[PDB]
Amino acid sequence: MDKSELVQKAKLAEQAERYDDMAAAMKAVTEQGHELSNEERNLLSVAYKNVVGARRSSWRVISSIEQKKKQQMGKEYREKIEAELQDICNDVLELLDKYLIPNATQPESKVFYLKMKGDYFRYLSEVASGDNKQTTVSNSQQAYQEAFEISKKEMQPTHPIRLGLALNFSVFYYEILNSPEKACSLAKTAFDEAIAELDTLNEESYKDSTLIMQLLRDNLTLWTS
């Protein structure tokens, strides 16, 4: 099991649409304890995004339907999906805490993995109750904030990762904390700082930075009303 072998496996898995495999491959790769390359890193993240992304979508479907006598079936099912979603997120957080974040040597990746830790705790927050929920919401924000402090020290305002952090962190406020004024504030700031440094935009990724900028604008102009 070369690292090269595992990566081909994952690239195939991806091609085949078996994302539990693609994730298991990258989780294997990650457990060899070397800093992931950018590509290695980007697969793990895509793999896991699709894995959990299917339970999130499924959960929503089952919760939409729940909102129609012996409905304790919707509930017993929801909780199965939820239990499963919690295990995927704990995988990724164990990985982030044990390997990705400590093995991270450089701004671009330190932020990326802290954003991801924010994401996954946010995902847990969607299905969490009581004490658990307060701990989740709070570790989500705490990870988002640490990535942002570092992105502000170390990256252009136009950096896709940094823009992508602002985007996710803004939604964290809107959807999870239910603080829209803050979601907007956090987003106008991130937008305005990017549109100031327009000369910094590199043609070499201009379309990505400008993509996420339009995403940011989207949410604002929706969110104002």
Partner: peptide, 11 residues
Amino acid sequence: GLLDALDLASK
């Protein structure tokens, strides 16, 4: 793909 890898909370 970086954009894909960044699972954007989306548009």
